[PDB]
Enzyme design. Structure first.
Site, PDB file in Angstrom:
ATOM      1  N   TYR A   1       0.804  -1.200   0.000  1.00  0.00           N
ATOM      2  CA  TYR A   1       0.000   0.000   0.000  1.00  0.00           C
ATOM      3  C   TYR A   1       0.858   1.281   0.000  1.00  0.00           C
ATOM      4  O   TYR A   1       2.002   1.266   0.416  1.00  0.00           O
ATOM      5  CB  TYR A   1      -0.778   0.194   1.307  1.00  0.00           C
ATOM      6  CG  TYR A   1      -2.145  -0.395   1.320  1.00  0.00           C
ATOM      7  CD1 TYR A   1      -2.398  -1.749   1.177  1.00  0.00           C
ATOM      8  CD2 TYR A   1      -3.235   0.457   1.426  1.00  0.00           C
ATOM      9  CE1 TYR A   1      -3.691  -2.242   1.210  1.00  0.00           C
ATOM     10  CE2 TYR A   1      -4.533  -0.004   1.460  1.00  0.00           C
ATOM     11  CZ  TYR A   1      -4.739  -1.363   1.364  1.00  0.00           C
ATOM     12  OH  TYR A   1      -6.043  -1.754   1.419  1.00  0.00           O
TER      13      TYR A   1
ATOM     14  N   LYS B   1      -1.240  -0.827  -4.313  1.00  0.00           N
ATOM     15  CA  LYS B   1      -2.602  -0.293  -4.302  1.00  0.00           C
ATOM     16  C   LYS B   1      -2.420   1.171  -3.882  1.00  0.00           C
ATOM     17  O   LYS B   1      -2.123   1.478  -2.729  1.00  0.00           O
ATOM     18  CB  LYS B   1      -3.565  -0.954  -3.311  1.00  0.00           C
ATOM     19  CG  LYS B   1      -4.962  -0.345  -3.313  1.00  0.00           C
ATOM     20  CD  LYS B   1      -5.936  -1.033  -2.387  1.00  0.00           C
ATOM     21  CE  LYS B   1      -7.307  -0.402  -2.406  1.00  0.00           C
ATOM     22  NZ  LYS B   1      -7.992  -0.489  -1.093  1.00  0.00           N
TER      23      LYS B   1
ATOM     24  N   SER C   1     -14.505   1.164  -4.062  1.00  0.00           N
ATOM     25  CA  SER C   1     -15.719   0.909  -3.314  1.00  0.00           C
ATOM     26  C   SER C   1     -16.977   1.201  -4.144  1.00  0.00           C
ATOM     27  O   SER C   1     -18.002   0.528  -3.987  1.00  0.00           O
ATOM     28  CB  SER C   1     -15.765   1.745  -2.025  1.00  0.00           C
ATOM     29  OG  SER C   1     -15.729   3.133  -2.327  1.00  0.00           O
TER      30      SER C   1
END
Lengths: 293, 293, 293, 293
Positions: D136, D164, D207
């Site tokens: 990340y 990510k 999302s």
């Protein structure tokens, strides 16, 4: 009204060892931008011009020389913003009388002004000069972060043409394009020109275009043409040079690369370090050989 | 040399509706601080003075009036810093010739200056003027934070006397007292006077002392005598007042409080909102009644 | 309920090379705190205990051991907060059943919780356990900053006793004392004990009290009597120690300082570096000779 | 090795009123993503799944159900990061055992870990599971920012596939593409898909793809085809929808938007506010009507 889209260099200024403006060198920087970098315009008196370290008389001098040297060959925007609103009006009127195409003003800084205070600030400069206005947004230095609704409030004045977006918030940039389609956006981050142009910015105002003007136009034009692979290759090369310039010292490295092109770009204005060290001169020479020869 | 310890008001300036200095009003504020607030000195040209919104001539005008009104009744410190080092040097020479007791300069802001450049700035002001210097630290507005080793580098210059610490890092505060026992510290956060005096600061430079000078003196002297419960009580009252002042608008509310004492404190200088609203005037009157009656 | 004012060590825990709890070492740490550091109490399962890197069963074990070793010798607070509220409730119930005098819970982290969410989190832990609660401020590790009005809302629940204040805002500190005089405050910054005590904090919870409890108590007691200069000499020495501890690595250094007292403080739990290098061990030996011999 | 490029939804989880997992609702969320949103994969156990407010056994349940419902129809990434490195290894081995294609782990948070500590954490999860890893960047919730040199160190382990990238730094994004051309980058900012795609990101984990999967694919692929004007139109409609989602409350609004598609997406898990208000419900129905009908 002269067209303000396209590629604008943020004009660097040549200073003598004593801090006074070197007019011969500044004219040389101007000629290089116009004749070699092939810019659409110059953005005079911005942070890049070492503007906020200078007196009002020096600011006027720089505006006088830039307009006399460029004449009508390119578009000219005058950045007249400051913490002193009377100084800003004074400078706005002076550049307006000179024929600058549009004014620009950073958000008032140092004190934590309210939005209404910022808004009155922009409206006053326009009302006292009669000139159009480009909001200069540079949050990294000002600490001013304006949201989409606040830009709409600034945009109630029809003389506010748009924003010089020296910020990397690409959501806000898309929101600005969506909410105000007739208002212009000029990207301020040279090393993120490709992604800004992907969202339709109208131009770019950049300090590296003083030396990397050829590549910056290619990135802009290739991106607007849908040639992303081609633009990305040139943005990669551009960023190797920008990374070197940032690491070696932004202002001094651009002036040193300019000296390698035969332009007397002079020294930095104090309290910025005025003279390049040996190592800094060495690095500039290396960047020149690798990326600008 | 004049003693620079004690209670110093950060002088506010009276402005006319057009933004010009109201000399008569400024002389009234000055007399109020000396005669009624009983300050040891005035800190002229600080943030509180609306200094960064003014022209160089306006700054000299305020310095001239303050010195002429105060004469030798109290100590005078001249804040002359700016982004423009040539302007700081000019102002520093001017206040030196006027006879100010010591100069002071905010860390150079806007551009992200390196420590060496910040140290050069201070050394230059000192070399060019010949005066002593108080480092003016205000991170909340400048964004500049210096640690213990950098303060030591600034202190290698024997004309640097200490620092106006307008920050609430009390660990750094103790570290400075520990490491540089011969250098002075003036607390710059009026609402934290008690805890700063518990670490032995040498004085306090504050904007609310223009109206809350009697209580400030008490908090400082009671804390130094070990009467913490009595001091805290007065700090509690003081901070009810400061909370009200901050909620209503610092600059205009101190000015409106001065008007209720019959001082012609005038308006704020643009970009600051120049006139208080009807609610602001009413809230000042209610604070006047509750805390300064 | 038991008296919770005074000096509380934030309990450090002993781990083996493999990360499991070393019970014998942990009991030695507890014993060193009660018998040598003369603490008023222990604050168990807090950040210093490496609590957030552990499983629920481990946190329960630590609670069990600490209560078993301390019996009713001193006051015991149990930190049970987590991002998991169901885990918070389970741990709150467990420590309640064991006889912990009160609970504490850090503000829920990782996600950006609203104030109503944070208040519901505290109200739920209290309702499901029936125990008193100490709320937090610790913004350096959570990024959660609460104001005077938010503390008022939390204080509507009569089981909230006060706050563990690990943020350096002495203005907020004085406002909390002003508005909620019957609510308790524990300072969480050991290097700023003096100024916190100057505003009447009721106690202090600190990681350095595991080795420097003697001095911490003196600072607190001297400050409370108004003997500021004597307290400050002890705060200065304490901060030389703390400065050294912080530069050498806080957790490992306090554990190496404990080992030099014959306490098997073991290793730190991964992700944190578990083993002190040879240079860290030597620096702790130097710190022990200079400040703790 | 399964292809991990493309469109991945960050899987939301359905909870019952009591905070327990609603299996039936979770399988329905999975089915909608695969069959209607037409994703290339699911990113399971991430912040969007409310993973950090859950127990180890709940995380495990969610991985079990997700893999059982999706089988081998799509690529599956398991987020296993935690402050607890032993928990991260346990979850990493469990998900590897279930046959997840690749693991991911947030940077260890709460404490301020050093770079070597973060690298050790990633290298430990990889060694202990034998699985590939996606690292990340994600600074908004963790506060951990990492540069090219550090990604370099992470990328010395051949099992690290890429990153990510959930913070919008487009300069870092291009530099990563430049230094490490074969390393993958998944954009984490759904509202900035267009600019991310212009720089050649390999995929996107989002999302809002749980409900706006169709437009997310079109932006991504049109951009990759250099059809920027069409891409931008869809990014603008997408962003009107995301602006509404964000204003109404992200997690609850995507769940209520799924309920309007016949999916029992249930409630949020405490400490997040668990049930939407009447106004939130009504705004979701309005957003559905304008943008997803």
């Amino acid at each position: 009204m002269r067209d303000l889209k396209g590629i604008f260099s943020a004009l660097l200024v040549s200073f003598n060892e004593d801090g006074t403006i070197n007019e011969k060198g500044l004219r040389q920087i101007i000629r290089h931008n116009i004749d070699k970098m092939k810019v659409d315009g110059l953005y005079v008196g911005g942070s890049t011009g070492e503007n906020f370290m200078l007196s009002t008389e020096e600011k006027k001098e720089i505006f006088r020389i830039a307009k006399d040297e460029a004449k009508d060959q390119i578009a000219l925007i005058a950045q007249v913003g400051s913490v002193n609103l009377k100084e800003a009006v004074e400078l706005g009127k002076y550049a307006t009388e000179l024929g600058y195409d549009c004014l620009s003003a950073v958000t008032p800084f140092y004190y934590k002004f309210s939005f209404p205070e910022i808004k009155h600030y922009y409206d006053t400069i326009i009302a006292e000069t009669g000139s159009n206005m480009i909001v200069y947004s540079i949050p990294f230095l000002t600490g001013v972060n304006m949201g989409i609704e606040q830009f709409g409030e600034l945009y109630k004045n029809p003389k506010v043409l748009g924003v010089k977006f020296t910020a990397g918030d690409f959501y806000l940039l898309e929101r600005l394009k969506k909410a105000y389609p007739n208002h212009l956006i000029w990207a301020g981050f040279d090393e993120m020109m490709l992604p800004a142009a992907s969202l339709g910015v109208d131009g770019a105002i950049g300090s590296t275009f003083n030396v990397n003007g050829v590549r910056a136009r290619q990135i802009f034009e290739l991106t607007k043409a849908g040639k992303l692979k081609e633009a990305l290759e040139i943005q990669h090369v551009t960023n190797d040079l920008i990374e070197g310039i940032l690491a070696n010292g932004l202002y001094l490295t651009i002036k040193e690369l300019l000296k390698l092109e035969g332009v007397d770009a002079g020294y930095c204005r104090e309290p910025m370090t005025s003279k390049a060290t040996a190592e800094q001169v060495a690095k500039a020479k290396d960047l020149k050989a690798k990326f600008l020869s």
